[PDB]
Design a protein around this ligand. Sequence first.
Ligand SMILES: Cc1ccc(NC(=O)NCCS(=O)(=O)Nc2ccc(S(N)(=O)=O)cc2)cc1
Ligand SMILES: [Zn+2]
Length: 257
Amino acid sequence: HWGYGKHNGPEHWHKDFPIAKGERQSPVDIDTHTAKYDPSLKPLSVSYDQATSLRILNNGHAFNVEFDDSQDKAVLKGGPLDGTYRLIQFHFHWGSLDGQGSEHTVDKKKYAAELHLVHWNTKYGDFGKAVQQPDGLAVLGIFLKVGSAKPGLQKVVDVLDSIKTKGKSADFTNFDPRGLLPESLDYWTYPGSLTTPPLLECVTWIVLKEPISVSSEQVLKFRKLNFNGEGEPEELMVDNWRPAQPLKNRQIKASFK
Ligand SMILES: Cc1ccc(NC(=O)NCCS(=O)(=O)Nc2ccc(S(N)(=O)=O)cc2)cc1
Ligand SMILES: [Zn+2]
């Protein structure tokens, strides 16, 4: 079915998911000289103290760390958001080379990877309802650049051997996601979509200005994962990012001046 290969990659997705050519597709290039500071934006409220991570899963396109979202335990609020959005999972998109891997770009700059912390609006009751709503999701996007190690990522890195191939999952409790955050919560925001099929146009994107640094050894271990399942031909899980899509009739706002 869909993937990131040369026969099933982003340029093919529109054939099964025609919304791929839609009006609010993600990711996009963030042109920092065209984004407008919006003083009516509120500070982001990242309330992750009570987060309950449960499991880490290789789903064949990326790996997801999943949380308990049956209560308000880890919630994103404020910024451009009305209401409360519960963290359901985070995952990353990364490259085969350090010069590529992010989905969003900043003045056409590609980062080595991009973290997506995926939240859903509690007014819709469950994640499956929320993805059918234009304000259903809030995804917090954080760029990764290669440099110093990120200590709070290392427990993620060290479990990846146990979920090498598609369909493998591992217990992953007591993981603390604020350890993946940069110092600053300055952000850009725009309305967009899931960046993988089904590409639903249900996401308020919140992309942090400040990237985090991860070590070369950390991102190398992302690149040892496999898209395939066990017993299938090995294909390294690299370059699992969708390129920038047309901005069309959207404005990206900045929370900072
Ligand atoms: C306890 C628990 C908690 C979570 C779960 N997982 C989910 O529901 N995960 C995935 C949501 S998804 O629709 O299927 N796809 C999707 C999401 C984000 C994006 S992106 N790339 O835009 O951010 C792209 C695609 C399972 C158990
Ligand atoms: Zn993503």
